[PDB]
Design a protein around this ligand. Structure first.
Ligand SMILES: CCCCCCCCCCCC[N+](C)(C)[O-]
Ligand SMILES: CCCCCCCCCCCC[N+](C)(C)[O-]
Ligand SMILES: CCCCCCCCCCCC[N+](C)(C)[O-]
Ligand SMILES: CCCCCCCCCCCC[N+](C)(C)[O-]
Ligand SMILES: CCCCCCCCCCCC[N+](C)(C)[O-]
Ligand SMILES: CCCCCCCCCCCC[N+](C)(C)[O-]
Ligand SMILES: CCCCCCCCCCCC[N+](C)(C)[O-]
Ligand SMILES: CCCCCCCCCCCC[N+](C)(C)[O-]
Ligand SMILES: CCCCCCCCCCCC[N+](C)(C)[O-]
Ligand SMILES: CCCCCCCCCCCC[N+](C)(C)[O-]
Ligand SMILES: CCCCCCCCCCCC[N+](C)(C)[O-]
Ligand SMILES: CCCCCCCCCCCC[N+](C)(C)[O-]
Ligand SMILES: CCCCCCCCCCCC[N+](C)(C)[O-]
Ligand SMILES: CCCCCCCCCCCC[N+](C)(C)[O-]
Ligand SMILES: CCCCCCCCCCCC[N+](C)(C)[O-]
Ligand SMILES: CCCCCCCCCCCC[N+](C)(C)[O-]
Ligand SMILES: CCCCCCCCCCCC[N+](C)(C)[O-]
Ligand SMILES: CCCCCCCCCCCC[N+](C)(C)[O-]
Ligand SMILES: CCCCCCCCCCCC[N+](C)(C)[O-]
Ligand SMILES: CCCCCCCCCCCC[N+](C)(C)[O-]
Ligand SMILES: [Zn+2]
Ligand SMILES: [Zn+2]
Ligand SMILES: [Zn+2]
Ligand SMILES: [Zn+2]
Lengths: 70, 70, 70, 70, 70, 70, 70, 70
């Protein structure tokens, strides 16, 4: 609901993103997210960005797409 | 549309490109574009190149490919 | 006939394939090809590799599978 | 079997995975595998990880997803 | 006092650092910093990291060294 | 003169600067320059920036610092 | 010391190196090392290579050079 | 005598120099050199370039200036 189905279906909060597709210092949101705006608000708590990644687990560098409505 | 569906589906005007994969100084076109001609002309306004990138938001370096219809 | 029908059904000559599914610097064959041997010979004219991609037009990076009878 | 049907359907033992979708130094399992745990155990014989890649042939770097239940 | 004299003498708060020498999404601290610990505390307010960069002005990507005592 | 003595003592007009220390597409000023403003004005004739680089010869990419008072 | 003074003055044990400039999977040596022999032996404990890097803190990818005395 | 005295006073043969001051893949000349012409000829034996660096020992990346009488 906050991320599209398929490859980039895992929501994560990352310190930043490079090249338009790589999230850096990513972590699963600390709490549940229900929509684009809430997703963005949770990540902003730690100064992070909302991204939709290919992996369900935290990672220093993961392929991720920009979030929609975030 | 002006960009293929999938990964590189985001139109952007970039100052240049390198390695045939990375656009530099990229920002969303100032106005709507409906075909390869529009896309090329609009980006030329700032002397930029029309590219199809992996992210819908401006960025200094993004993975991008040359627009096919322009 | 040179490429399986479906997703990767468009023959192209690419400088190389990476990550097992991405063709870089791809272009439509200069001449017509009717079988694996033709595909290989026509692409080899420019030091290219024969691949079956999803897109009909040329592209600096496309989703492609190695040609069947390369 | 041990990998879902589709693009990422080829079992491989790779030294590791980066960006959450790329296996490095991948090789086909030496022996057949029948389930997650089995797949994992075999790849562990060479200190490798069990992944499902886009190609049936070994490669220094390939697109792969982690094996389910492995 | 928070950064060494020379090339990397400009304190900045950045979203992260790559390759051990490149700060990403950097900005001059919002307030004055007097020591390593205070520098680190100010940057942590926005979830940023304390770095010593070659430029006195904010930048999306700048050469920066890890901070000492931070 | 317009650049400090030492490593970064060679005046150049470069299309731009990245990472806060690298000038791209640099060329020696067409005419002599005597101070910050002068240096800047000249480089502006070709849409370039005034920088102090480590080498007296033009280059696609060189280590350079911004010109003081320019 | 074990690493030259300057930019690459931080000893680290890394899983490997690429392009003769980037160390991968790097962490500070578990114990003190006073020369090239110590450095090499200590890193061998985890099958790692002794490198001199630009950052004093562990990281998955850092700019590093081979240790001269090891 | 082949390199100016001081900082960059150690002759080395490097695959190339980048950014106007960095020698990559540098090694001490195989034979002795007594003048610019010798330096150039001895390095050219391995397709290398003659540079004057700060370090006496070999290195994958060092601070170097182009040889005076290359
Ligand atoms: C942010 C990660 C960027 C990784 C970039 C990796 C580039 C690899 C280029 C390999 C080129 C190999 N070859 C044989 C064509 O020279
Ligand atoms: C950075 C390398 C990126 C390669 C990206 C390849 C994207 C392929 C998208 C294919 C979409 C195919 N189809 C039939 C669904 O339109
Ligand atoms: C390093 C980037 C790799 C990107 C790989 C992208 C694979 C996309 C596959 C899309 C398949 C779509 N359908 C629509 C499922 O073909
Ligand atoms: C962090 C380092 C970034 C370096 C970026 C270098 C961009 C070079 C672009 C050269 C473009 C050349 N040309 C002819 C296509 O305009
Ligand atoms: C996931 C981020 C990947 C960034 C990859 C950048 C790849 C650049 C490849 C350049 C290849 C150039 N050449 C001449 C060897 O074809
Ligand atoms: C942030 C990603 C940067 C990727 C840079 C990739 C550079 C590839 C250079 C390939 C050069 C190939 N060749 C044949 C011209 O030497
Ligand atoms: C890990 C990726 C780090 C990327 C650092 C990129 C710095 C890019 C600077 C691009 C400047 C482009 N332009 C057109 C303004 O010259
Ligand atoms: C963050 C993106 C950084 C991109 C850096 C791209 C460097 C490209 C260098 C290309 C050199 C090509 N050539 C023909 C002169 O060897
Ligand atoms: C954005 C797409 C980036 C693709 C980068 C691909 C790097 C491929 C390196 C392949 C090396 C192959 N081999 C056989 C020489 O080991
Ligand atoms: C995101 C692209 C990552 C590309 C990584 C390519 C690694 C190539 C390693 C080649 C190693 C070759 N050899 C002979 C030393 O085993
Ligand atoms: C985070 C920025 C990384 C930038 C990496 C730039 C690599 C440029 C390699 C240029 C190689 C040129 N040449 C002629 C030797 O092939
Ligand atoms: C970590 C050091 C990275 C150095 C990267 C240097 C890239 C140099 C590209 C030089 C291109 C020179 N030339 C003449 C072909 O334009
Ligand atoms: C951080 C290293 C950045 C290296 C950037 C290298 C850019 C090389 C651009 C070469 C352009 C050559 N040419 C013929 C197209 O003008
Ligand atoms: C990523 C390329 C890095 C090149 C780094 C060169 C660092 C040189 C440090 C030289 C220190 C010289 N000295 C005499 C002060 O020891
Ligand atoms: C892309 C990285 C470039 C690093 C350039 C580093 C230059 C260091 C110069 C150090 C000079 C030291 N003394 C001690 C002033 O020679
Ligand atoms: C974000 C992409 C990161 C790709 C990292 C690829 C590392 C390849 C290391 C190959 C090492 C080969 N060898 C023989 C030195 O062990
Ligand atoms: C400021 C970050 C710079 C990262 C630079 C990475 C440069 C890699 C250069 C590889 C050159 C390989 N080769 C074979 C052309 O000498
Ligand atoms: C994050 C920085 C990644 C830098 C990757 C640089 C890759 C350089 C590959 C140079 C390949 C040169 N050659 C001659 C083997 O084709
Ligand atoms: C802009 C730079 C982006 C760098 C992304 C780097 C991903 C590195 C993954 C390294 C994995 C190393 N190792 C040894 C654990 O396989
Ligand atoms: C964040 C660091 C990413 C480093 C990626 C390095 C890719 C190196 C590929 C080397 C390929 C060498 N060779 C000989 C097989 O072409
Ligand atoms: Zn909420
Ligand atoms: Zn139109
Ligand atoms: Zn304070
Ligand atoms: Zn010892």
């Amino acid at each position: 609901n906050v991320c599209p189905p398929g490859l980039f279906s895992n929501p994560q909060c990352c310190a930043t993103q490079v090249l338009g597709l790589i999230g850096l210092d990513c972590k699963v949101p600390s709490q549940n997210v229900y929509d684009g705006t809430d997703f963005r608000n949770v990540c902003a708590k730690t100064g992070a960005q909302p991204l939709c990644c290919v992996a369900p687990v935290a990672g220093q560098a993961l392929l991720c797409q920009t979030a929609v409505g975030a």
